[PDB]
Amino acid sequence: STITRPIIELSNTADKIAEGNLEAEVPHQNRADEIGILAKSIERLRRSLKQLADDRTLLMAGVSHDLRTPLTRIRLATEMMSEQDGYLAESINKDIEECNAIIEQFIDYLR
Amino acid sequence: STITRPIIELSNTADKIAEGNLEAEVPHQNRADEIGILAKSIERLRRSLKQLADDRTLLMAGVSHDLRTPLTRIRLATEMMSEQDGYLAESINKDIEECNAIIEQFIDYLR
């Protein structure tokens, strides 16, 4: 009956990982027999999920940062234009506004 | 020895998923006993990985497509400006080129 338990513990841990508890430590990792190998495989699955999560987060940050540089430069350049070319500057102003709007929506929804 | 086999088969399938085989079918899924419950746990982990993969793909495509619109608009407007503000137009043109470069780099790394 004692051997029955580590099986239940392994299945339970897998559930915790899938539900979004990436920090939940897998049990029976120190075991050397077939059970401990099963524990190791669950750890491998945990690593995959954790990596994919971190990738998405860092992706959002990197894109927004790099975009900030070109956007700022354009707005300043349009500010320096004379009134005679205002109607053309107004167009580029509309574009930069739309771009900032799209980025804002993405960050708000994404937790 | 017969009982030893399914444990190895389960561990092997989990390893296949971790190494990038999201389509690797889990064995002993239809079992109802303790081994069947373990099979169900492995399948749930597979679903998590597959979901995260689909998320990354859709995210990349959506952002790049929408960005194409504001870029094209600024390009046309800057071409209409008079020579008196040519030096200002040149800066905005350089900026939009930079943006296109960033998008190309992302796709090239992950086709």
Side-chain angles (χ1 to χ4, degrees):
Chain A
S1 53
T2 63
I3 305 160
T4 310
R5 278 292 197 85
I7 308 300
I8 308 301
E9 288 169 35
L10 288 154
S11 70
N12 279 323
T13 311
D15 302 325
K16 297 185 188 183
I17 303 160
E19 59 168 35
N21 289 332
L22 306 177
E23 274 283 325
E25 302 284 325
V26 186
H28 307 300
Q29 281 203 81
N30 57 304
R31 288 198 75 88
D33 60 11
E34 276 76 35
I35 311 297
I37 302 166
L38 182 77
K40 283 160 185 161
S41 67
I42 298 172
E43 189 68 35
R44 294 178 75 76
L45 301 164
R46 190 152 76 120
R47 285 182 69 174
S48 295
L49 290 165
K50 201 201 287 281
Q51 199 73 65
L52 271 152
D54 292 35
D55 283 35
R56 192 173 179 182
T57 314
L58 298 164
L59 189 73
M60 195 158 68
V63 184
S64 177
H65 192 99
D66 290 35
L67 288 170
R68 287 276 167 84
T69 320
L71 291 160
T72 311
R73 293 176 80 202
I74 303 155
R75 203 191 282 281
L76 272 91
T78 59
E79 273 210 325
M80 295 178 205
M81 285 165 59
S82 63
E83 289 193 35
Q84 295 196 307
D85 283 340
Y87 63 90
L88 283 162
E90 285 175 35
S91 193
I92 302 172
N93 277 315
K94 285 282 203 272
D95 300 325
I96 184 166
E97 191 197 325
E98 196 70 35
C99 288
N100 192 74
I102 303 165
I103 304 157
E104 194 124 33
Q105 278 191 281
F106 270 109
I107 305 170
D108 212 325
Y109 301 130
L110 270 78
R111 193 167 59 194
Chain B
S1 287
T2 54
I3 305 161
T4 310
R5 291 161 195 280
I7 305 300
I8 306 300
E9 277 186 35
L10 287 159
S11 70
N12 276 329
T13 313
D15 289 35
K16 283 182 205 275
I17 301 163
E19 60 167 35
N21 299 317
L22 308 179
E23 291 156 35
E25 290 274 35
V26 186
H28 312 293
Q29 276 206 74
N30 57 282
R31 290 195 79 93
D33 58 15
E34 285 89 35
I35 309 299
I37 302 166
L38 181 74
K40 288 188 192 184
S41 75
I42 303 173
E43 187 67 35
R44 289 190 191 191
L45 300 157
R46 192 154 74 119
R47 201 177 196 183
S48 291
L49 289 163
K50 202 156 159 63
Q51 269 195 258
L52 274 158
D54 295 325
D55 285 14
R56 205 175 179 162
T57 47
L58 272 154
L59 194 86
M60 198 205 282
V63 185
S64 191
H65 205 79
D66 295 35
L67 292 170
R68 288 180 88 271
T69 312
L71 285 164
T72 312
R73 291 282 172 83
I74 303 165
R75 192 178 188 278
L76 271 69
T78 46
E79 281 172 325
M80 289 172 101
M81 279 176 60
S82 38
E83 206 201 35
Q84 296 182 316
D85 287 20
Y87 57 90
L88 285 162
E90 290 205 325
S91 54
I92 303 175
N93 280 69
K94 194 169 75 261
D95 300 325
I96 55 166
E97 290 176 35
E98 199 174 325
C99 288
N100 208 255
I102 303 157
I103 304 154
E104 206 164 325
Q105 199 195 327
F106 274 106
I107 303 161
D108 280 35
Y109 207 83
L110 175 62
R111 271 179 196 196

